Symmetry: C3
Subunit: 118 residues, 3 copies
C-alpha cells in the first residue's frame, strides 16, 4: 500500500529554461517530451509523475534546491518508474518493491497517479 497524486498547471513548466529542464529531467525523459506534439504538456505530465511517485513512497519529504532527476519516468509502451540515488535508497529503506505510474493532461493541467508496493 502506497498512493500518490499530483496535478500541475501546464504553464508551470518553462521549457526555454535549459538549466532547470536538464537539472530535473534525465536525458531519456527530455528526449521523449521534446518528441511530443505538445512539449510543455509533456514535461508537465512527467513532472506530475515524478511528484506523484515520490509521494507514493511516503518518505522524508523533499525541498528546494532538491532535484527530482532521481525519479525517472521511462516511456519507451506504458510508463515505467526507475529510481536512483537517494530516491532509490529511501525506497528500499522503506521496503518499496515496485512503483507504477500513470499520466494524463488536457488543455488546463496534468495529473499523475502512482501506487507503491511494500
Amino acid at each position: 500500500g502506497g498512493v500518490g497524486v499530483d496535478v500541475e498547471l501546464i504553464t508551470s513548466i518553462n521549457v526555454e529554461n535549459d538549466t532547470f529542464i536538464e537539472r530535473n529531467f534525465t536525458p531519456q525523459e527530455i528526449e521523449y517530451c521534446s518528441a511530443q506534439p505538445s512539449v510543455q504538456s509533456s514535461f508537465a505530465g512527467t513532472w506530475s509523475a515524478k511528484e506523484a511517485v515520490f509521494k507514493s513512497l511516503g518518505v522524508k519529504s523533499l525541498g528546494g534546491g532538491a532535484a527530482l532527476k532521481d525519479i525517472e519516468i521511462v516511456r519507451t509502451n506504458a510508463p515505467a518508474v526507475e529510481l536512483h540515488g537517494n530516491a532509490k535508497k529511501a525506497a528500499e529503506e522503506a521496503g518499496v518493491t515496485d512503483v507504477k505510474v500513470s499520466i494524463s493532461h488536457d488543455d488546463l493541467q496534468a495529473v499523475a497517479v502512482a501506487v507503491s508496493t511494500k
Copy 2:
C-alpha cells in the same frame, strides 16, 4: 499491479455527434449518460474511465464498457480484443472511479494480476 489515469475537458465530448458517440459507447453506456443531469459531463466521465482502464491494462473503445449506476461504484466489463489482451496479460480484475467538475473529468483505474 496496474494503474491508469485519464483527464478530459468536458467539451471534448460532442453529444450531438451521433457517429462518434455510437462508435465509442455501448448502448447501455449511452442510455446512462443521457439520463444524467449533465449529459456531456457524463459522457466525458465515461470516456475518461475507458481511457484510464485501457492504460491500467498496460498492453475504437467500445470494447471497454463502463457499467454505471448512480450511488454504486462503476463496473468495468471488457470485450473483444480488450478482453483477450487482458487475459493475455494476466489481468484478473479492473476497478475504476470517475469524477468531474465544471472544467474537466478525471478517472483512475487499478488493475490486478
Copy 3:
C-alpha cells in the same frame, strides 16, 4: 477499491460555518485554517473524504489526518468504520493535490 474526486477550489465556501462544522472534524478544521490557502486546503480535504468514500464501495465520519512534510492518513469513525469492516476493508490510503483551479484526491482500499 479505488476512488477519485476532483473539486473546484471555489466549491468550498469557508464562510459557510454550517457546512464546514458539519463535515470536518476539529483537527481537520484546525489544519486547514493553519494553511497558506485555507480554501484550497478545505477543498483538498473534502476531495480526500469523497475519494475515500468511493474506494470503500458501499462526511465527518471520514477523517483525514494531515501534518506537513508527511503523507495524509485516513482514520475512519462511526458508520464509516463499521461499513468498512463490514466490507472487509483492511486499509485505506489517500493522496491529495491542488493547483489554482481545483483539488484532486485519489484513494485506494485494501481487502
